[model samples]
Target: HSHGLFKKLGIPGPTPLPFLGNILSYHKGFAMFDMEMHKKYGKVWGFYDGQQPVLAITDPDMIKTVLVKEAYSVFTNRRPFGPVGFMKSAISIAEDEEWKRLRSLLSPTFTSGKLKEMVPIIAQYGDVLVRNLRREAETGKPVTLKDVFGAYSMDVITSTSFGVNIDSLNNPQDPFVENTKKLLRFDFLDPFFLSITVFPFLIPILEVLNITVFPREVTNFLRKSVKRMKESRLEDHRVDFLQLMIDSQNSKALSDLELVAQSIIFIFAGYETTSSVLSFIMYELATHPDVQQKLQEEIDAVLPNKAPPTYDTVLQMEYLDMVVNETLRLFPIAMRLERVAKKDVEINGMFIPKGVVVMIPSYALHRDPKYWTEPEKFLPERFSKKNKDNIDPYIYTPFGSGPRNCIGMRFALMNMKLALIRVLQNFSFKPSKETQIPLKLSLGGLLQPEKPVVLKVESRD
Candidate 1:
């Protein structure tokens, strides 16, 4: 038991130096390095973040144990976000009774009926995205896929959440959009933040020092904007996210901070993650032309890309579902899912003591050679009904596992499917010389393309 968690639990890992643990290496290629560790240490082993012991889990049944079996009791809280300012109150970070209350209040906003109603809002904003992309494609230009998609997602989020159309796809530099970038586009390279994540002990210290993930200016912008919305007393008839928040505040009697916190979470989380997924889906299509072709044929037969998507049409498109699911398997927006243990729990005779952080490196699990055939390749057939039933459920968790899985899962999927249908209906994505094959992923921030997914898009007409 001389080597931190390795000694205490009889887990093995590459030797870690004093005070640094594996921060230097883990920070550089976090996803790949995590997968490599799983390969070396077997299914469930312990890792160190500068002496802070974190359990690394890859076994599906084991993950089920953490995310499900003990979820309601011993495994409740997610790893605390590193001082994200007002965002600390976000339901994603809230714990215990506060999390339960907030989640209950917010559930109705993301229900299937709500998402179905949201289809038009997403499709409407997606039309502007199609127009902008079509203009570039018609002129034979190579576009930065992520940037445009970022704007597209922002437009969808802002409009849906606030009932205000910023049209970010056409106006990427809009003040609201710029501030959102400042808020979400974090600098994970900072040693201070890195240490906080790895050591775990530094979190309270950083919080006390007021170390925030977003800059002061970003917080100021959100505060001012929320104030403006309150002052205007804008007449709204629709039940948008903001409306729901105001209603809940009136009935539930929450503090002003609570209301603003939920609003900010809806705006920031709603846009960035969805934007990342759309970009990755296009990257997969650009690199795998055959799969893209098959998807286009399947989509076209069901609904024209030019036509507005309907809820029923989207649900019935089986290939559309498989394509999106497969893309997520490779480039899930959340590559790692973590929970801090509430009590001692044993899995496979390994006792995970209370207060230890449990990390499920989904990137490794999804690509694990044991569960997937040709794990590295882009094959949507793996998700087909015939094969899907046979596959292990825990291994393919793009939206994550258990009751605490992503709240916005259905909405994100609907937004993605609608945008893809509209774009592919009007244009065909062709691989360009600028496109990077065997695409590289970002180490910092949410999982996304290391570079803009550059490709040539042509008119389907």
Candidate 2:
């Protein structure tokens, strides 16, 4: 095989340096790196990490191959860590037999029926969020819905993951919510997260340096909570995640460490991404009154006057679904999806060597001109049935595509829709002067508005 895969694939790429690869140029800023690379390299590109070449794939057809046809062999699991330590044993990080087992065991917990059962819990949290926001709006003050929504998401995840009622919406400063906020703080990203992603071998060293990526206390708290839930539900009939895990437990059932890891992973994974989506959606709605009005109209048309929003009602709102899709297009939480090749494979006439990391940049691909027209514009009509037929299926993957896509997708969407219905039904929001225009992206860790997203909300009635 030619060492210069970039040239062979007709892809432009950056020159590589020994040992450090393209880190010298790419590490400064993510947005800068992506913008420069895409502007120069076009649709496909390559760069090297200390002589190990990594391919950048943004083509929809090529992405489809990597995510679907050759997924099992080309896209293997990435290690998971942080406060939610379930990387090795949880479905997200486990590979081969372990991954298969966990995925199978936990699949039922997220089924349509189960999600239906969890709808009331999600609505309850949504109601709590509305009540809090209503109270804040009464003061005629600008409220940061991001913080409020983050707490709401934490409450929903805690209820679903551990079956515990932390009531983050009411308490706001609850220890669990506070710990999660600390866990999400980007300060830990510099030394700890970089080592984990760039040099997986240094994970143990990073841990030994007394570098705490996720607070040890938070992990312990989660572990004890899982143990208590498992013990308490030993006899109680339940169909939630904890019950599924307990039922699937064998003599070698997940240990306390593994259970805590999975629970934390579930909570963290389920919380931040969806919360960010909700926050960004609200921000966009605040700015775009017409769009918000249309969405609210759909909500009103579908929901019953006497009852709270239900799963069926939320699912029936076609416009609301499009709004969520458009929001995801602009602000996808997991901006990039990564997979390591498990075996040598050929894709779109190019050879992919085993062990090379394949990056599907959702951020770049969603905005690629080839896949979308007026890609940067916030237009939900593009996702409507008529226009959606003309677009490639692989082009707009917010949760991801193929088998390894987010398992909690239904849960996340359900939670978001319910929350939006409750909030928009009662309050009208507009972007305030404090809300930054052309939002600055966070430089490290998860994607979020770099500063507080302040918006003014008024009671609709």
Candidate 3:
């Protein structure tokens, strides 16, 4: 067995243990871990995830080379998550040509026109969210933002993506909410899942056995539910994400299995990710009253008529974009961007062999003193029009960069803004005793607070 593979490849990195690799060193959190590693090892370094070698890059130039310049020719696929059954058809897990085809087919579902059509549906959920929040605020107690925001996101996803209005914000006990919760409980520390990293050979066997990272019952439930919903909509004139994809089926752009798979992935992608961002944004607003005040003022000034915000109205608020951008920069939903090499490639004198995982440490790059001034502060001004030109696109890609970046970026941003506007229009957030100062973050696939985000809600009007 070759020891010190990174040494032979002429890359500097932390030393690895036999089978476990550097996984033991990052118990604190991957964001902090990558930050520390980047400082010690400089721009390009190597490490292992179990026995699988990975290169972590922080150099903006090299990041551009990998994620932007050579995305299609050299780095065309995300590192495989080894999905089975319907999960195989997920665009997130698809590779190479299949990835291109899926991305092309699903691209239109998120266009501006389609998003405009969905804005009313999202605002309805936002209205429900405001009512729910007011009800909670009336109790004169602190609110767990994770719970309320999570419910808002659930409702939005249900209505916008699934074309059903469960109103989870008002009715949190809906079976859809319960099953969706079970579906996203993908525990990274589960022994069976962790072992696949240590013994890569088991991936194929696991796939052959039709194993899934999620529970079988939960996945089966979503699969059947999405299929039933599609069937019911066959002759209907619904205008939602599911309907958009179902329309593609008539052109043979997506098969029944693929349609269902993509719908489930939309839930998986949109639900937790959007909720987490909303929670973080509210947490920031509660703690940073100055930023919050400025954002609220912007919202008020931009939409003076007090009409329910449309897509164009939301776009008029620049500070809102800055606030959201800064929040995403500080607590990136994806800590790292991953790509597997399709063939041998070299960027800036570093050789990447075929099949090696290349990681762009987005969290570290976002905080790197080189690209940002006072990077740790909650300053949305960095994204203001006057200063935004200085930011390198690769250095601060919260949704990601290049061809395969998050497909739902606009969809997520619009919902986030609509919710923020509706809430800030009538209420303001303040830090409560239960709010965790210097919030502790979890080492999960997405950035999450270790404790529930609690904030006091007060009526501004």
The estimated TM-scores of all candidates read: 0.93, 0.90, 0.96
- Quote model 2's TM-score: 0.90
- lDDT of predicted model 1: 0.78
Q: Lowest lDDT 10-mer window, candidate 3?
A: 182-191
> Which residues of candidate 3, in runs, are more than 4 Å off?
185-190, 443-446
| Local accuracy of candidate 2 as per-residue lDDT tens digits, 1-461 | 33466666665688765455676674545545765788788877787644456787877889888888777666756524443333356568688677766676677778999899888777777777877898889988899876798888887877766566776766767766666655453433466544444565666665556554456777666666666667755665554677667666753355656656677678757766777888899888888899999988877777745258887888888999999998898877777777788888888787877777788778777777777788878898988989878766677788888888888888888888888898888889988888898777777545678886889989977
lDDT tens string, model 1, 270-341? 777887888888888877778888888987788754456799998999988999999998887777888898
True-structure lDDT of candidate 2? 0.74
- Judging by lDDT, tell me the better candidate of 1 and 3: 3
TM-score, candidate number 3? 0.96
Counting clashing residue pairs in each candidate, in order, gives: 2, 0, 0
- Between candidates 2 and 3, the lDDT winner: 3
Task: Tell how far residue 194 is off in model 3, in angstroms.
Answer: 2.5
Writing each residue's lDDT as its tens digit, candidate 3 over 306-328 gives 66798889999999999999999
Which of candidates 1 and 3 is the stronger one according to TM-score?
A: 3
In model 1, residue pairs whose N, Cα or C atoms come closer than 3 Å (at least 3 residues apart or on different chains), thus clashing, are 1-7, 305-425
Please identify model 1 stretches exceeding 4 Å from their true place: 1-3, 185-189, 197-211, 443-446
